[PDB]
Short mmCIF file of C-alpha atoms and ligand atoms in Angstrom, two decimals:
data_model
loop_
_atom_site.label_atom_id
_atom_site.label_comp_id
_atom_site.label_asym_id
_atom_site.label_seq_id
_atom_site.Cartn_x
_atom_site.Cartn_y
_atom_site.Cartn_z
CA UNK H 53 5.14 -155.04 -117.26
CA UNK H 54 1.38 -154.91 -117.91
CA UNK H 55 1.68 -157.37 -120.79
CA UNK H 56 3.74 -159.77 -118.69
CA UNK H 57 1.05 -159.55 -116.01
CA UNK H 58 -1.69 -160.39 -118.52
CA UNK H 59 0.30 -163.42 -119.69
CA UNK H 60 0.95 -164.73 -116.18
CA UNK H 61 -2.67 -164.18 -115.13
CA UNK H 62 -3.90 -166.00 -118.23
CA UNK H 63 -1.45 -168.91 -117.84
CA UNK H 64 -2.45 -169.36 -114.21
CA UNK H 65 -6.14 -169.49 -115.11
CA UNK H 66 -5.55 -171.99 -117.91
CA UNK H 67 -3.54 -174.30 -115.67
CA UNK H 68 -6.21 -174.13 -112.96
CA UNK H 69 -8.95 -174.60 -115.57
CA UNK H 70 -7.43 -177.24 -117.90
CA UNK H 71 -4.47 -178.46 -115.87
CA UNK H 72 -2.04 -177.21 -118.50
CA UNK H 73 -1.37 -174.13 -120.63
CA UNK H 74 -0.62 -174.42 -124.34
CA UNK H 75 0.95 -171.67 -126.45
CA UNK H 76 -2.12 -172.05 -128.64
CA UNK H 77 -4.54 -171.45 -125.76
CA UNK H 78 -2.47 -168.51 -124.58
CA UNK H 79 -2.45 -166.97 -128.07
CA UNK H 80 -6.23 -167.30 -128.42
CA UNK H 81 -7.10 -166.10 -124.92
CA UNK H 82 -4.95 -162.99 -125.37
CA UNK H 83 -5.93 -162.43 -129.01
CA UNK H 84 -2.28 -162.53 -130.05
CA UNK H 85 -0.08 -164.42 -132.49
CA UNK H 86 1.75 -167.57 -131.32
CA UNK H 87 5.05 -165.93 -132.30
CA UNK H 88 4.36 -163.20 -129.75
CA UNK H 89 3.52 -165.86 -127.16
CA UNK H 90 6.70 -167.88 -127.74
CA UNK H 91 8.74 -164.70 -127.38
CA UNK H 92 6.90 -163.68 -124.21
CA UNK H 93 7.18 -167.21 -122.78
CA UNK H 94 10.96 -167.15 -123.27
CA UNK H 95 11.09 -163.90 -121.31
CA UNK H 96 8.94 -165.33 -118.50
CA UNK H 97 11.15 -168.43 -118.52
CA UNK H 98 14.25 -166.25 -118.27
CA UNK H 99 12.73 -164.34 -115.35
CA UNK H 100 11.84 -167.64 -113.63
CA UNK H 101 8.06 -167.23 -113.63
CA UNK H 102 7.77 -170.56 -115.41
CA UNK H 103 9.73 -173.23 -117.24
CA UNK H 104 9.30 -173.98 -120.94
CA UNK H 105 3.70 -178.19 -121.40
CA UNK H 106 4.73 -175.06 -119.54
CA UNK H 107 4.77 -175.17 -115.75
CA UNK H 108 4.72 -172.20 -113.41
CA UNK H 109 7.45 -172.00 -110.77
CA UNK H 110 6.43 -171.14 -107.22
CA UNK H 111 7.06 -167.50 -108.15
CA UNK H 112 4.72 -167.58 -111.14
CA UNK H 113 2.04 -169.38 -109.12
CA UNK H 114 2.08 -166.90 -106.25
CA UNK H 115 1.95 -164.02 -108.74
CA UNK H 116 -0.73 -165.68 -110.83
CA UNK H 117 -2.97 -166.30 -107.83
CA UNK H 118 -2.52 -162.68 -106.76
CA UNK H 119 -3.32 -161.37 -110.28
CA UNK H 120 -6.50 -163.46 -110.44
CA UNK H 121 -7.48 -162.17 -106.97
CA UNK H 122 -6.79 -158.59 -108.04
CA UNK H 123 -9.00 -159.09 -111.10
CA UNK H 124 -11.87 -160.63 -109.12
CA UNK H 125 -11.69 -157.92 -106.45
CA UNK H 126 -11.80 -155.12 -108.99
CA UNK H 127 -14.83 -156.68 -110.63
CA UNK H 128 -16.64 -156.95 -107.29
CA UNK H 129 -15.68 -153.36 -106.54
CA UNK H 130 -17.23 -151.91 -109.71
CA UNK H 131 -20.19 -154.31 -109.39
CA UNK H 132 -20.91 -153.18 -105.81
CA UNK H 133 -20.80 -149.46 -106.60
CA UNK H 134 -23.27 -150.14 -109.39
CA UNK H 135 -21.29 -150.18 -112.63
CA UNK H 136 -23.23 -151.69 -115.56
CA UNK H 137 -22.11 -155.33 -115.56
CA UNK H 138 -21.25 -155.29 -119.27
CA UNK H 139 -18.69 -152.52 -118.82
CA UNK H 140 -16.85 -154.12 -115.89
CA UNK H 141 -14.46 -156.55 -117.57
CA UNK H 142 -13.02 -154.02 -120.02
CA UNK H 143 -12.42 -151.47 -117.24
CA UNK H 144 -10.82 -153.98 -114.86
CA UNK H 145 -8.56 -155.15 -117.72
CA UNK H 146 -7.20 -151.65 -118.10
CA UNK H 147 -6.89 -150.41 -114.53
CA UNK H 148 -5.78 -153.70 -112.93
CA UNK H 149 -2.18 -153.03 -113.98
CA UNK H 150 -2.03 -149.45 -112.73
CA UNK H 151 -3.13 -149.78 -109.12
CA UNK H 152 -0.58 -149.96 -106.32
CA UNK H 153 -1.05 -152.71 -103.75
CA UNK H 154 -2.07 -149.99 -101.30
CA UNK H 155 -4.98 -149.05 -103.57
CA UNK H 156 -5.89 -152.72 -104.05
CA UNK H 157 -5.84 -153.30 -100.31
CA UNK H 158 -7.96 -150.17 -99.72
CA UNK H 159 -10.42 -151.20 -102.40
CA UNK H 160 -10.58 -154.52 -100.60
CA UNK H 161 -11.63 -152.79 -97.37
CA UNK H 162 -14.24 -150.81 -99.26
CA UNK H 163 -15.78 -154.00 -100.66
CA UNK H 164 -15.83 -155.50 -97.16
CA UNK H 165 -17.41 -152.29 -95.83
CA UNK H 166 -20.39 -152.59 -98.17
CA UNK H 167 -20.57 -156.37 -97.72
CA UNK H 168 -20.95 -156.24 -93.92
CA UNK H 169 -24.16 -154.16 -94.00
CA UNK H 170 -26.67 -154.08 -96.87
CA UNK H 171 -28.16 -150.81 -95.64
CA UNK H 172 -24.92 -149.19 -96.81
CA UNK H 173 -25.52 -150.51 -100.32
CA UNK H 174 -29.06 -149.15 -100.10
CA UNK H 175 -27.64 -145.79 -99.02
CA UNK H 176 -25.18 -145.70 -101.91
CA UNK H 177 -27.93 -146.67 -104.36
CA UNK H 178 -30.09 -143.79 -103.12
CA UNK H 179 -27.34 -141.33 -103.99
CA UNK H 180 -27.35 -142.66 -107.54
CA UNK H 181 -31.05 -141.80 -107.61
CA UNK H 182 -30.41 -138.24 -106.45
CA UNK H 183 -27.69 -137.86 -109.08
CA UNK H 184 -30.04 -139.13 -111.79
CA UNK Z 74 -4.53 -142.26 -123.68
CA UNK Z 75 -1.56 -140.13 -124.75
CA UNK Z 76 -3.88 -137.68 -126.51
CA UNK Z 77 -5.88 -137.37 -123.28
CA UNK Z 78 -2.71 -136.60 -121.30
CA UNK Z 79 -1.74 -133.84 -123.72
CA UNK Z 80 -5.22 -132.29 -123.75
CA UNK Z 81 -5.42 -132.45 -119.94
CA UNK Z 82 -1.97 -130.87 -119.70
CA UNK Z 83 -2.75 -128.12 -122.23
CA UNK Z 84 -5.99 -127.16 -120.46
CA UNK Z 85 -4.19 -126.88 -117.11
CA UNK Z 86 -1.33 -124.78 -118.55
CA UNK Z 87 -3.75 -122.35 -120.20
CA UNK Z 88 -5.84 -122.15 -117.03
CA UNK Z 89 -2.78 -121.49 -114.87
CA UNK Z 90 -0.51 -119.38 -117.10
CA UNK Z 91 -2.97 -118.12 -119.69
CA UNK Z 92 -1.24 -119.98 -122.51
CA UNK Z 93 0.48 -123.26 -123.37
CA UNK Z 94 3.89 -123.35 -125.07
CA UNK Z 95 5.39 -126.43 -126.70
CA UNK Z 96 8.33 -126.17 -124.29
CA UNK Z 97 6.03 -126.03 -121.25
CA UNK Z 98 4.11 -129.04 -122.54
CA UNK Z 99 7.24 -131.14 -123.15
CA UNK Z 100 8.60 -130.11 -119.75
CA UNK Z 101 5.37 -130.96 -117.94
CA UNK Z 102 5.00 -134.34 -119.66
CA UNK Z 103 8.72 -135.11 -119.56
CA UNK Z 104 9.02 -135.65 -123.31
CA UNK Z 105 10.93 -134.31 -126.32
CA UNK Z 106 9.46 -131.22 -128.01
CA UNK Z 107 9.38 -133.26 -131.22
CA UNK Z 108 6.92 -135.67 -129.66
CA UNK Z 109 4.88 -132.62 -128.61
CA UNK Z 110 4.89 -130.98 -132.04
CA UNK Z 111 3.74 -134.29 -133.49
CA UNK Z 112 0.89 -134.72 -131.01
CA UNK Z 113 -0.10 -131.05 -131.30
CA UNK Z 114 -0.33 -131.28 -135.09
CA UNK Z 115 -2.53 -134.32 -134.45
CA UNK Z 116 -4.76 -132.50 -131.94
CA UNK Z 117 -4.92 -129.64 -134.46
CA UNK Z 118 -6.03 -132.06 -137.17
CA UNK Z 119 -8.67 -133.56 -134.86
CA UNK Z 120 -9.78 -130.01 -134.07
CA UNK Z 121 -9.06 -129.95 -130.34
CA UNK Z 122 -6.94 -126.86 -130.85
CA UNK Z 123 -5.28 -124.58 -133.39
CA UNK Z 124 -1.50 -124.63 -133.91
CA UNK Z 125 0.09 -119.58 -129.35
CA UNK Z 126 -1.67 -122.90 -128.78
CA UNK Z 127 -5.41 -122.27 -128.41
CA UNK Z 128 -8.04 -124.86 -127.50
CA UNK Z 129 -11.23 -125.07 -129.57
CA UNK Z 130 -14.54 -125.35 -127.72
CA UNK Z 131 -14.13 -129.10 -128.30
CA UNK Z 132 -10.72 -129.15 -126.63
CA UNK Z 133 -11.95 -126.96 -123.77
CA UNK Z 134 -14.92 -129.21 -122.99
CA UNK Z 135 -12.74 -132.32 -123.14
CA UNK Z 136 -9.94 -130.59 -121.26
CA UNK Z 137 -12.26 -129.67 -118.41
CA UNK Z 138 -13.81 -133.16 -118.21
CA UNK Z 139 -10.30 -134.69 -118.09
CA UNK Z 140 -9.17 -132.44 -115.24
CA UNK Z 141 -12.44 -133.26 -113.42
CA UNK Z 142 -11.81 -136.97 -113.99
CA UNK Z 143 -8.30 -136.64 -112.55
CA UNK Z 144 -9.41 -134.72 -109.48
CA UNK Z 145 -12.29 -137.12 -108.85
CA UNK Z 146 -10.06 -140.19 -108.98
CA UNK Z 147 -7.60 -138.62 -106.58
CA UNK Z 148 -10.42 -137.82 -104.13
CA UNK Z 149 -11.74 -141.37 -104.41
CA UNK Z 150 -8.39 -142.99 -103.53
CA UNK Z 151 -7.79 -140.34 -100.85
CA UNK Z 152 -11.17 -141.05 -99.25
CA UNK Z 153 -10.70 -144.82 -99.08
CA UNK Z 154 -7.37 -144.40 -97.32
CA UNK Z 155 -4.70 -144.76 -100.00
CA UNK Z 156 -1.35 -143.25 -98.94
CA UNK Z 157 -1.33 -139.77 -100.44
CA UNK Z 158 2.07 -140.25 -102.12
CA UNK Z 159 0.88 -143.21 -104.18
CA UNK Z 160 -2.33 -141.56 -105.40
CA UNK Z 161 -1.01 -139.50 -108.32
CA UNK Z 162 0.81 -142.32 -110.10
CA UNK Z 163 -2.19 -144.65 -109.77
CA UNK Z 164 -4.68 -142.06 -111.04
CA UNK Z 165 -2.36 -141.19 -113.92
CA UNK Z 166 -2.57 -144.83 -114.88
CA UNK Z 167 -6.22 -145.70 -114.36
CA UNK Z 168 -7.79 -142.43 -115.53
CA UNK Z 169 -7.50 -143.50 -119.19
CA UNK Z 170 -9.06 -146.93 -118.66
CA UNK Z 171 -12.33 -146.14 -116.90
CA UNK Z 172 -15.65 -145.87 -118.73
CA UNK Z 173 -17.87 -142.90 -118.03
CA UNK Z 174 -20.22 -145.27 -116.22
CA UNK Z 175 -17.46 -146.17 -113.74
CA UNK Z 176 -16.47 -142.52 -113.44
CA UNK Z 177 -20.06 -141.57 -112.63
CA UNK Z 178 -20.42 -144.39 -110.08
CA UNK Z 179 -17.11 -143.44 -108.47
CA UNK Z 180 -18.59 -139.95 -108.37
CA UNK Z 181 -21.55 -141.16 -106.32
CA UNK Z 182 -19.27 -143.15 -104.04
CA UNK Z 183 -17.28 -140.02 -103.25
CA UNK Z 184 -20.54 -138.17 -102.63
CA UNK Z 185 -21.61 -141.07 -100.40
CA UNK Z 186 -18.69 -140.64 -97.98
CA UNK Z 187 -18.61 -136.83 -98.21
CA UNK Z 188 -22.22 -136.33 -97.07
CA UNK Z 189 -21.79 -138.24 -93.80
CA UNK Z 190 -18.46 -138.40 -92.00
CA UNK Z 191 -19.87 -141.26 -89.90
CA UNK Z 192 -19.53 -143.46 -92.99
CA UNK Z 193 -15.85 -142.58 -93.29
CA UNK Z 194 -15.45 -143.60 -89.63
CA UNK Z 195 -17.13 -146.97 -90.23
CA UNK Z 196 -14.82 -147.49 -93.21
CA UNK Z 197 -11.78 -146.78 -91.04
CA UNK Z 198 -13.09 -149.22 -88.44
CA UNK Z 199 -13.13 -152.01 -91.03
CA UNK Z 200 -9.61 -151.12 -92.16
CA UNK Z 201 -8.61 -151.78 -88.56
CA UNK Z 202 -10.60 -155.03 -88.43
CA UNK Z 203 -8.51 -156.54 -91.24
CA UNK Z 204 -6.69 -158.41 -88.42
CA1 CA G 170 -5.23 -156.55 -118.42
CA1 CA G 171 -7.25 -159.51 -115.84
CA1 CA G 172 -2.25 -140.20 -117.57
CA1 CA G 173 -4.11 -136.88 -115.23
#
């Protein structure tokens, strides 16, 4: 499931970025072999996420948009609570697949909480100082 | 990640029962005792424990940090409003993919809400503003 999610998220991004998604671009972006991509694409095709360049069905597009959103939100989350920027991508890449929608939605409210009043960010930063 | 789950599980069993048997480990992790004997031999080789099953100081320190990590992540999701029943499965999944930096920052976040209940109330307000 996680792997399928990484493929769909990547395909969505490529289509939005280049207008198309090639097996070759998919393979490179995911650091995998084209044989693994072809196999995965056939599975996604079977499950109706896309059609074998390759075009996403409405189902793959809705899921892709959501996966990209999930990624972006999780990066903002760690960024806001002060995680070293260089560590953020790798952590989001691992946890993004293991968070229920309830957790994603709650994390979304947390981000909004800190975004609607900068004093709150200042208050959270102060705690980091005490901890130090 | 699997090694971390075994170490975390072994530390808890020893802390609760006073010892950790292969059968208790397999039962707690829902796996075959063969898979446990394999992992244990591996943890023994890496010096986290000695093949009853006794943790080395290395395994104890790691074991304790892992249990702390688990507890912390549950408190974090609990505090932001995640349905209690979904918390365990999510933590079990993300615990292995968070850097210590993120863990430490999540630690401050939890401290942030715990030191002033008024902040928890403002967070709840926003959750109700969602529309
Ligand atoms: Ca990923
Ligand atoms: Ca991602
Ligand atoms: Ca786990
Ligand atoms: Ca755990």
